[PDB]
Amino acid sequence: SPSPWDFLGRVLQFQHGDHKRWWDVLAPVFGISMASIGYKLDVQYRHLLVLYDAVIPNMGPFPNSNASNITWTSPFPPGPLEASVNYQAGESSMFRFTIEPVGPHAGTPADPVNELAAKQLMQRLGQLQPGGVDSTMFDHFYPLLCVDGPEARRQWDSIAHIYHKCHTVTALDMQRSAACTLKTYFPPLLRSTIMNTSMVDIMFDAVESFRKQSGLYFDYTKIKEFMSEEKTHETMMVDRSYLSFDCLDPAKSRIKIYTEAKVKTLEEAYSFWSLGGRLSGPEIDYGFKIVSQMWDAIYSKELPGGKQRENNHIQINWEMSAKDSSVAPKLYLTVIEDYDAYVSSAIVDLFTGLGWAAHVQTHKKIEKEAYPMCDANPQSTHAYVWISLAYKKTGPYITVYTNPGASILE
Amino acid sequence: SPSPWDFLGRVLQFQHGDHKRWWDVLAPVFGISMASIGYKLDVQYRHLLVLYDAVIPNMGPFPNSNASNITWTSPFPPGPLEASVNYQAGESSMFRFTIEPVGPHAGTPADPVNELAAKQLMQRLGQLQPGGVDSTMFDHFYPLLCVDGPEARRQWDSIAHIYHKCHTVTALDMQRSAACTLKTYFPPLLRSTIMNTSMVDIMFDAVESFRKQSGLYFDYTKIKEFMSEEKTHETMMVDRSYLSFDCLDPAKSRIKIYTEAKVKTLEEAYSFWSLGGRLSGPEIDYGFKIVSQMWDAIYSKELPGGKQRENNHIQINWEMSAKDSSVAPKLYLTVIEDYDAYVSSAIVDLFTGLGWAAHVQTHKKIEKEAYPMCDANPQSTHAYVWISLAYKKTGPYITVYTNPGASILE
Amino acid sequence: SPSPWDFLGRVLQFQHGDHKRWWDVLAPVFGISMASIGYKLDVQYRHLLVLYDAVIPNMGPFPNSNASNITWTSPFPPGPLEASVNYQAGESSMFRFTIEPVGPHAGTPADPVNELAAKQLMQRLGQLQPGGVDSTMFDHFYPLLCVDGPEARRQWDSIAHIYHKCHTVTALDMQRSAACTLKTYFPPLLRSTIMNTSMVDIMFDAVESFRKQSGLYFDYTKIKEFMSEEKTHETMMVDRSYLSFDCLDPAKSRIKIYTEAKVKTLEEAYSFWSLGGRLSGPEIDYGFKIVSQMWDAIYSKELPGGKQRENNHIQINWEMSAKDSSVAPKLYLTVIEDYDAYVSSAIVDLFTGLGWAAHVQTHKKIEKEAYPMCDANPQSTHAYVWISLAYKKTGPYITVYTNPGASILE
Amino acid sequence: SPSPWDFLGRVLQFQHGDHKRWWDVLAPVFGISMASIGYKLDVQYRHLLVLYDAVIPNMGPFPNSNASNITWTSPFPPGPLEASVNYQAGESSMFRFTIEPVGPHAGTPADPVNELAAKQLMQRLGQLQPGGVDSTMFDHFYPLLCVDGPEARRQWDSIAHIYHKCHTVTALDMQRSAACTLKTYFPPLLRSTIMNTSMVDIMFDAVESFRKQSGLYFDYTKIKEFMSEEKTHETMMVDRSYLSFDCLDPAKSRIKIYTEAKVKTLEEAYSFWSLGGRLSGPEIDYGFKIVSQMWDAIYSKELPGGKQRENNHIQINWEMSAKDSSVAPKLYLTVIEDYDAYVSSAIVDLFTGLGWAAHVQTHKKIEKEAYPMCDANPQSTHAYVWISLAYKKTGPYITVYTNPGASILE
Numbered sequence A, B, C, D: 001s002p003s004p005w006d007f008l009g010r011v012l013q014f015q016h017g018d019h020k021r022w023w024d025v026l027a028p029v030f031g032i033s034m035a036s037i038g039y040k041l042d043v044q045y046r047h048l049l050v051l052y053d054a055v056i057p058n059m060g061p062f063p064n065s066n067a068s069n070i071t072w073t074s075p076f077p078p079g080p081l082e083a084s085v086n087y088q089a090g091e092s093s094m095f096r097f098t099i100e101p102v103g104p105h106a107g108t109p110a111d112p113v114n115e116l117a118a119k120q121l122m123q124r125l126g127q128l129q130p131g132g133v134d135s136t137m138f139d140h141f142y143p144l145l146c147v148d149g150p151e152a153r154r155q156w157d158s159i160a161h162i163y164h165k166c167h168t169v170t171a172l173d174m175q176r177s178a179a180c181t182l183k184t185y186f187p188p189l190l191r192s193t194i195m196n197t198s199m200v201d202i203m204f205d206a207v208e209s210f211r212k213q214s215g216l217y218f219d220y221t222k223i224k225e226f227m228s229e230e231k232t233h234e235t236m237m238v239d240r241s242y243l244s245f246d247c248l249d250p251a252k253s254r255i256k257i258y259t260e261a262k263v264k265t266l267e268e269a270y271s272f273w274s275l276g277g278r279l280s281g282p283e284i285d286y287g288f289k290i291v292s293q294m295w296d297a298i299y300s301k302e303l304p305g306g307k308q309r310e311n312n313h314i315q316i317n318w319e320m321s322a323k324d325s326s327v328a329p330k331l332y333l334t335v336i337e338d339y340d341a342y343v344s345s346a347i348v349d350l351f352t353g354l355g356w357a358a359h360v361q362t363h364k365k366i367e368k369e370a371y372p373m374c375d376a377n378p379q380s381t382h383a384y385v386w387i388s389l390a391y392k393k394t395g396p397y398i399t400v401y402t403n404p405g406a407s408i409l410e
């Protein structure tokens, strides 16, 4: 019997050819990932139909021979920034994928700031699951962190120098229950540039506004104190920081503060992991043990093409709970420019150490079926992009990000 | 969680508005029928996507306020001729539905004979399940029984008087396995009219051609002998007869000869059931017991609107096996112009007598959910159209046909 | 040879059935109007393709039997608020039409404020004519007068009582040169309600902001003085006022302040026409002569259905020039609930008095061909909606608005 | 102002991505050709909308990187076999284009013979211009010359060895009046192969059938006599012959018999031009003078890549008139594998000799704008495919065929 993506691509009508190309590229990947996780055929159908109706129409142009049609400049290759499978204890695995919503004419004089794509995506997604998307947090943070179209157009000279004029990124957690949780990431770089204000200060002022406007405890003291220090700024690129929240009931949602850091040593990794020792506990220690393990497993190996390793690029988030003052970190090792073989082997060794044999097989299956380049090309550099590490009191929490449009790069 | 047809209508893109209207009308019905049978959500998705891609684009215009857009004249209301659920022993239930493939411009000077709709439908269906549709029998019988476009256009004056210029009807058995078996019905009335030849003779000459060209035993002696008799012609409308075959491997397919008969008594029913006593056996006797039961259960009641019952309209088929000389009948009681309440009650009493309680509940559920008019309007005349009765050696075989576009008539 | 709308509807593919229905209704009307004006076939093709790509996808649902699908509440019937032909001296005639951009799911929990429709329309329109749409004025006035989605959702309780939650209306002047000038109307009623601020004050503060931010003289002293008076408020509904500007180069654009007034006498008409005598000159006098002529020609006749005339509903604008302190009025007689025969006859008598015989014939032709109900039904109340009167130094300036979806009401 | 194809591609919605790609390739070419001829913008719009609705959906897959999606094998590159501009005396120029209608799944088990594409194209074309397409001749010749799907499938083993299983080709004359005359070409090679019958005999038996069935004089004596001779068969490939007729009123239509011949000398050219001297007159002499001129102008030059010229590939038709016994020839010099520069220069010298300066400029303009490769690449071999020469009593009749998808080959 045909797999859901085969049959769907055979039947589905596509409003645009770019949607058909994006489907051909991604539906195999997303469906193979869901199927290896264990999603049910009806759930695969629902989620692939979501990807067809809400998402792909908001992926933007499909890159051609020379990528002449990609008018929306970005460091990331066109398409989903990632397609990830989270792995937790108890054979828990959830498929999720992130997209920067891009319009068909973003970057051009008609949509120079790509304002409508994310809103269209959210509208479609709420129409497909009425009641699943709550815009309370989005409605509070969109004026504070994001720059609407009119503002960006009036204040263009202030942001025209910026290469990636990103203002809102959307991730869709794709639950085994066919429910899609929308997550919104706001990089306020445009906001800071227009207002000429510290990133830290505007982000945390927005969080505090939401605190007082909602009555929810989002403890941001430690994060602000650490991120304001000068030592942190030596390594921490704050121009690359962004805020995230789940588009749910604020009492059931979260606030996460992300930032980028190019560090050289594990002590700087701990600087970003524990907020200068401010955060403490057994979970911090265990998570950093796992982080050091994967550090010396991945960044120990030689870089492709005999290029020396200047420094280890990492991202980091700190997750604030609405119920409690808890701040919990999640470290993201960037492995885009590394051997997919070494990344895969490090993941496998980590899972094997954690006793996650089923996750080992799921990961190998997803790599083999959805990412054939990894085995076909020993020198592959286009599948994995990030390895997230966290240790919740449930246990380890490791997500493995992958470029779902690696077929385009190979 | 939404039902497959809700979600699909929310996501699916439709090439034409008529397809959207037909979907709104039928997908509820077809999906409720499949779901009450027990089809799996993935199977419902696949079958509704088939109905979206292959079928509905070949249903023709959707009837408007005044049915001004129905340029393809037909006795049947626009849409599927039926949407049926077969009921056999052992809680066996299969959903199937019949369509006369109509084009968007059938009946107009561009498609005055509606030649391409059925071929397009078969092409799409084979593209969606390559290897499921075998055209051996279709390729043999299409020149013999059906009239292509060029012929009909050259020989128009011979057939212009005909009201329903039907030449090929397509039924889709919708298996629980997501496989759709295509069945083709050929009314050669146009063929006979152009060639000025007996219906009986051309149909059975085609069957005999196929016999000698295939080496398969399709015993048509008894059927021909009975249908040639003059007594039969007093009741039997032969202008309304047609041939059917399953579009499968001829060694795994069948040949069925249908005809219409307006009879008054059960002895004429037996005339058509047993081919003037030529067919015999316990199955014939039991099947006719069931037929007489439903005869005196349905045609005993008074007709709606105090209109007297002139005669009992029936159809009948005789099924020839490729493996054996067997001829087996299937009698179709026409109950389109009768109280849907009385038809439903007769079905329920029949099933209860057969011990088919589960089928009783399935039938009541399908009526309540997919056909609300039956309970809302005591004087309903727009749900049921046919009751097929047969007795295979497996046991009783009762199909219950229903106008799936009854929402349009009420 | 077929007319452009016939052929186009025959060839064009429509993304949705509602677009096909809207086309069937409006393309005849718009095309007949353009053709009676004298637009060239290529211009008709271009403008109807604009109406197909940019507009109709932003008209919203097509009203069904019971208008159950119109989830966006509005006093106006669904569709274009008007389809107008302006008539000036020298046989100058320009086709234009106004639309309140509505989304497919406006009024529902997904788009409770209809935020994206107007922006999508402008985006498409700029993509179709890059460089024709300038958003300087839109970018300045959108935050001041319009309420974005997040704000409206946070401040819902303040505006939930409002029936027509309109915030931006788009008119497309459809030039004989195939160029479409976009005009944006901002009713800040939601803005005033959320901020609990005077309509007059916020509108004119926005205008003054634009003055100081642009260096363009938009004299709003007389308008503000008149509209602030208490006598004016006795007749003037200020809850119904709105601002308009042409989406062009601000030095080549305009600012117009509209308001609604239910007056009884011609002295109140002059109150609104001359801003309490503040505006003066020969043009004012001549324009008011024409206004009184049409007043006593139209509002003199009896209302349909023997309903007595409580008061004469009028709208009024005052047009400020970027080049000069000029304020010029345009009075809009509302004739929606009046005999289309009497309105047509008044228009004809006016044109005949002005010597506009060619416009008389153009108007009669448009009425006969695009609005057959006017002749078919003597008691017609569904074609004309407004009669605008102005007297520029060029000469008289009379626009005649018509419900282009009158086919739906009759 | 944008050109019709620019604006149309900006607005039009495309049912499939292949249609969008084909549009991007061809609409520029077709529109530039029409515009250089002098077609009016409304006519360009109508004809490009025809190419969008009827044709491109019946061009088949768009060739990808490796032409893996071209499942319908053919000697010709995918797309229109040609896009031609006929040039006659008096600055008379018409654009016409030929297409072999291919389905989206032609060559696959679903449409192994590509049966529905041509019929769909004719249906759409008649729907767009009801009364323009007359199927009398098509209805007579389709059973005689063409092989339907069922026959080809039953008789597959007889034709499976054939590489190009072509059975019907459609050309659209695109008149300056926006009317599209459909022309159907029937290569009966499949018919002859299945029936194992001479091409000559079946073609001319069909023509004679039509004669007796219509009362129209189609003199085929000379053509049959010549084509039956053995000397002709030494050069004449009869496996490559085909019949053509205009899909109009038979009394206003024509019958043309085409064949392919690989000849070496001008005396063989005259053999095919005059039917072994059977045809005579001043027109024959003048036409052959022009043919010899272009022979020694084009085939005199060296072949690209230093490949020696084995023989001169030509096609030839003989046009029979329904009104008269006239047989008139049209010789087609095949110049696909020759320098587009030399072909263009020969065309220019010919036109200059004929006094057709305006045609010279039209041809150079079409080459420069629609075929930039000719000037950009001196060694171009992908623009011109045929040069037709005829001499009607009106005067010379020279058509210049060009691969409209040359952008794909370069």
Ligand SMILES: CC(C)[C@@H]1NC(=O)/C(=C/c2c[nH]cn2)NC1=O
Pocket (backbone or CB within 6 Å): A081, A082, A098, A100, A164, A166, A168, A169, A171, A185, A186, A187, A240, A242
């Ligand atoms: C796109 C960037 C401007 C910005 N920075 C990131 O690296 C990022 C990636 C990401 C991966 N999964 C979720 N978000 N998110 C952002 O918002």
Ligand SMILES: CC(C)[C@@H]1NC(=O)/C(=C/c2c[nH]cn2)NC1=O
Pocket (backbone or CB within 6 Å): B081, B082, B098, B100, B164, B166, B168, B169, B171, B185, B186, B187, B240, B242
């Ligand atoms: C449509 C008629 C011309 C013709 N006669 C019928 O009554 C018929 C109905 C049917 C119901 N289920 C399957 N076939 N089939 C036919 O071919």
Ligand SMILES: CC(C)[C@@H]1NC(=O)/C(=C/c2c[nH]cn2)NC1=O
Pocket (backbone or CB within 6 Å): C081, C082, C098, C100, C164, C166, C168, C169, C171, C185, C186, C187, C242
């Ligand atoms: C409530 C709104 C519809 C608001 N009110 C109006 O009467 C109006 C109509 C209109 C006709 N032509 C142009 N505008 N414009 C608006 O913005």
Ligand SMILES: CC(C)[C@@H]1NC(=O)/C(=C/c2c[nH]cn2)NC1=O
Pocket (backbone or CB within 6 Å): D081, D082, D098, D100, D164, D166, D168, D169, D171, D185, D186, D187, D240, D242
């Ligand atoms: C496609 C071939 C099977 C066959 N042979 C040809 O060369 C031909 C080309 C053509 C150019 N313009 C019109 N016809 N036509 C045919 O039917």
Ligand SMILES: CC(C)=CCSP(=O)(O)OP(=O)(O)O
Pocket (backbone or CB within 6 Å): A171, A315, A330, A332, A386, A388, A399, A401
């Ligand atoms: C890997 C990057 C840069 C972003 C991470 S977002 P996430 O997807 O890690 O969020 P969760 O906390 O896993 O929901």
Ligand SMILES: CC(C)=CCSP(=O)(O)OP(=O)(O)O
Pocket (backbone or CB within 6 Å): B171, B315, B330, B332, B386, B388, B399, B401
């Ligand atoms: C009820 C009518 C008129 C047609 C019957 S066809 P069928 O659907 O009975 O065929 P099967 O023998 O059930 O496959």
Ligand SMILES: CC(C)=CCSP(=O)(O)OP(=O)(O)O
Pocket (backbone or CB within 6 Å): C171, C315, C330, C332, C386, C388, C399, C401
């Ligand atoms: C008739 C109503 C209510 C609105 C008028 S807008 P307009 O269309 O009169 O604008 P112009 O000044 O004619 O451009």
Ligand SMILES: CC(C)=CCSP(=O)(O)OP(=O)(O)O
Pocket (backbone or CB within 6 Å): D171, D315, D330, D332, D386, D388, D399, D401
């Ligand atoms: C040259 C190719 C091979 C076929 C020629 S068809 P045609 O376009 O020349 O037909 P006309 O006689 O020009 O109508």
